[PDB]
């Protein structure tokens, strides 16, 4: 069996800027021809074989060369050899674009009339098209800080902007949301002077 | 043009087989080519599986060699996996391929003894541009699709991630950012998908 390896499980890249991804073979891929192929997998989608992209290399190191960097090039990167039996894959590498701070808008929304009947109550905290990836999500009921009872799931790096967003989600019964009023999302973030807060009063 | 489109259960029980079929349109299997399985781990690790080629020949990973078949109809052009005795390692998503180059869509298969659960989905209510969703939760297993105005509505869209809960069934929102004049004269609705359990949730989100 060949063993690929891929050391780097993820690139940082300037946009505009050129990146290597390096690839290397327990076993040399020539046979003058060299059995070596590069896939992108970009989010949600299977992987896709692959002028700005090039490929180098003897025949236990390879690189993928990416030139001038677009928002559209994130995704994770794999080297596959097709040399022999069984055909094997490196680990994959992240092209991750660094931007420049880009502060999140904020929404909250309260629990739907439709959940209410189950005796679960979802109250959510939507941070859209943030950069970098780092926020902080606190909430709050009746002004009490709550803790345990919330999840944070991100977004990979958005295609278009090299953002990310995010949303939080508050678990609670139903009969402890109707004992309480005011429900407040308060979120910090780089680009933000000031701790920005969403809030709702129940019903 | 060629392509892959693959069916079978996304839930498989532990110890049990699973059985994929991959439906090849406009390319008959028989006349070139080698049809590959290939599966993604969680964690995104690729794993070639084995192939059929195009004379029925084939070729599997040593790591499987006593658990895996490929097989195929040239008369309804599509080929098959099975995989005996799975075990919760063998969760992945499954691809068949024609070649490096040509990829089905690709279906996840959960190993468990659960049993499939369509989703609830919930309005996310808006409360120059508003944004709005849907939160689509407890299902079972892996994934939802989630679309809006049946694919009309594509930019500005952001569907989440699953996540596990604690109760073993998975959560994720969608949101779209949508005009905020548009709010009162304008219908928003998300679709949702759960091919698992043959579910499709339609709900209309409306200002509170």
């Known amino acids: 069996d060949i063993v690929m390896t891929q050391a780097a499980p993820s690139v940082p890249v300037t946009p505009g800027e050129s990146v290597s991804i390096s690839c290397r073979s327990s076993k040399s891929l020539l046979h003058g021809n060299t059995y070596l192929y590069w896939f992108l997998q970009r989010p949600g989608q299977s992987p896709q074989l692959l002028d700005r992209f090039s490929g180098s290399g003897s025949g236990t190191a390879f690189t993928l060369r990416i030139s001038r960097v677009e928002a559209e090039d994130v995704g994770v990167y794999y080297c596959?050899?097709?040399?022999?039996?069984?055909?094997?894959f490196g680990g994959g590498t992240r092209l991750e674009v660094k931007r420049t701070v880009a502060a999140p808008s904020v929404f909250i929304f309260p629990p739907s009339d439709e959940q209410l009947k189950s005796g679960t109550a979802s109250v959510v905290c939507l941070l859209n098209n943030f950069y970098p990836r780092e926020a902080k999500v606190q909430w709050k009921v009746d002004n009490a800080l709550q803790s345990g009872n919330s999840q944070e799931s991100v977004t990979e790096q958005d295609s278009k902007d090299s953002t990310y967003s995010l949303s939080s989600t508050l678990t609670l019964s139903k009969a402890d949301y109707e004992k309480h009023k005011v429900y407040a999302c308060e979120v910090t973030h780089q680009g933000l002077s000031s701790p920005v807060t969403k809030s709702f009063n129940r019903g | 043009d060629v392509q892959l489109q693959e069916s079978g259960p996304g839930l498989v029980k532990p110890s049990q087989s699973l059985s994929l079929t991959c439906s090849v349109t406009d390319y008959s299997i028989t006349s070139g080519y080698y049809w590959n399985w290939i599966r993604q781990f969680p964690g995104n690790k690729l794993e070639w599986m084995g192939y059929i080629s195009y004379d029925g020949s084939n070729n599997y990973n040593p790591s499987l060699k006593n658990r895996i078949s490929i097989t195929r109809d040239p008369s309804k052009d599509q080929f098959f996996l099975n995989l005996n005795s799975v075990t919760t390692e063998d969760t992945a998503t499954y691809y068949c391929?024609?070649?490096?180059?040509?990829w089905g869509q690709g279906t996840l298969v959960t190993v468990s003894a659960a049993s499939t659960k369509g989703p609830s989905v919930f309005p996310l209510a808006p409360s120059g541009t508003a944004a709005l969703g849907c939160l689509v939760k407890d299902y079972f297993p892996e994934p939802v699709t989630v679309s809006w105005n049946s694919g009309a509505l594509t930019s500005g869209v952001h569907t989440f991630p699953a996540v596990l809960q604690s109760s073993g069934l998975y959560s994720l929102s969608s949101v779209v950012t949508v005009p905020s004049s548009s709010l009162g004269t304008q219908t928003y609705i998300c679709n949702v998908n759960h091919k698992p359990s043959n579910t499709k949730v339609d709900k209309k989100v409306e200002p509170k």
């Open positions: 596959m050899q097709h040399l022999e039996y069984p055909y094997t």
């Open positions: 391929t024609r070649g490096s180059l040509v």
